Amino acid sequence: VCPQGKYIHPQNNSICCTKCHKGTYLYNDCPGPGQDTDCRECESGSFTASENHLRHCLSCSKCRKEMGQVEISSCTVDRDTVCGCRKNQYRHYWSENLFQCFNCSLCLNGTVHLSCQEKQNTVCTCHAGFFLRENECVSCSN
Amino acid sequence: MDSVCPQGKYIHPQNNSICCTKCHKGTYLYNDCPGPGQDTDCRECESGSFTASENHLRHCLSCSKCRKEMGQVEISSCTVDRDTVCGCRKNQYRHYWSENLFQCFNCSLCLNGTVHLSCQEKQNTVCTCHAGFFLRENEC
Numbered sequence: 601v602c603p604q605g606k607y608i609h610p611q612n613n614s615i616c617c618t619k620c621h622k623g624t625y626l627y628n629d630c631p632g633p634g635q636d637t638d639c640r641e642c643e644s645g646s647f648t649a650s651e652n653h654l655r656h657c658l659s660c661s662k663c664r665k666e667m668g669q670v671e672i673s674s675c676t677v678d679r680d681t682v683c684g685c686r687k688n689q690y691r692h693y694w695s696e697n698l699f700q701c702f703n704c705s706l707c708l709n710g711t712v713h714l715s716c717q718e719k720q721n722t723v724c725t726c727h728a729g730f731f732l733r734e735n736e737c738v739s740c741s742n
Numbered sequence: 743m744d745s746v747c748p749q750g751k752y753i754h755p756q757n758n759s760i761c762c763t764k765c766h767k768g769t770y771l772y773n774d775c776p777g778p779g780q781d782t783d784c785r786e787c788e789s790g791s792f793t794a795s796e797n798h799l800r801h802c803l804s805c806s807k808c809r810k811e812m813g814q815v816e817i818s819s820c821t822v823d824r825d826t827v828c829g830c831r832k833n834q835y836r837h838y839w840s841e842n843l844f845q846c847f848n849c850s851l852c853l854n855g856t857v858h859l860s861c862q863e864k865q866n867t868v869c870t871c872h873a874g875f876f877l878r879e880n881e882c
């Protein structure tokens with residue numbers, strides 16, 4: 601079929617044009633072998649992520665800010681925005697692909713194991729033989 | 743805009759206002775492009791070879807070899823538009839000794855107590871001591 605990186609001409613299923621590039625749409629399909637495809641760039645704010653032959657770019661998506669989000673590199677012809685987590689809170693994907701930043705919990709009096717990190721909250725184990733509970737250090741059933 | 747050629751094109755080595763589309767990933771520069779309305783010529787990459795992405799690039803890069811010098815296996819084929827990817831066998835956890843060097847290290851059969859965090863591709867198990875001391879550094 602069209603080898604790597606070429607697609608099938610709709611009009612004539614015997615001609616294979618280059619696929620566009622990230623960032624650009626197809627303004628029109630290349631006229632016959634040998635010929636370039638008209639890839640005109642994305643009107644900001646929009647993108648396409650990849651090889652494609654798309655008649656339009658996909659708009660920028662803003663962050664689902666209900667989840668205490670902030671994006672942290674902007675949407676820009678290849679890149680849809682990346683949102684990620686606000687000044688050292690943590691990225692709880694629930695379920696992906698929504699997620700929220702909960703706040704980073706410092707331990708509820710235990711000894712720090714893992715420090716707070718983009719996939720996981722700080723991780724605790726505890727002071728003075730308390731019964732261990734995620735963050736919390738709760739003595740026992742009480 | 744602030745640019746030279748636009749998005750998707752390189753400038754010709756020669757006519758410094760020919761621009762040409764870039765070779766796709768999977769494919770190299772067979773020869774640069776004649777003039778502004780014919781495609782650049784891109785041939786597939788040879789087997790056991792691949793290339794980034796947007797290349798105006800003379801050669802493919804050769805595949806990669808997984809380092810058994812750190813407990814790896816190719817977890818997926820190297821094929822033209824993606825490298826050989828490797829990893830640790832199921833399940834060791836993987837330790838990026840500098841993001842680029844990385845090791846295979848085993849999961850813990852729950853050491854010191856019982857299983858908290860199951861262990862996986864990135865990271866080890868985390869357990870908790872059935873004998874509550876209080877993490878001095880790394881023991882109980």
Ligand SMILES: *c1cc(-c2cc3c(cc4n3C(=S)N(CCCN3CCOCC3)C4=O)s2)cc([N+](=O)[O-])c1
Nearest residue numbers: 767768792793794795796797799800801802803825
């Ligand atoms: C896909 C494609 C690539 C790339 C290949 C190269 C990159 C940077 C350089 N290469 C090569 S092959 N190369 C040759 C050095 C040229 N010099 C000769 C002596 O005089 C000075 C110039 C580079 O400089 S990127 C890479 C990847 N990848 O993801 O790394 C994938």
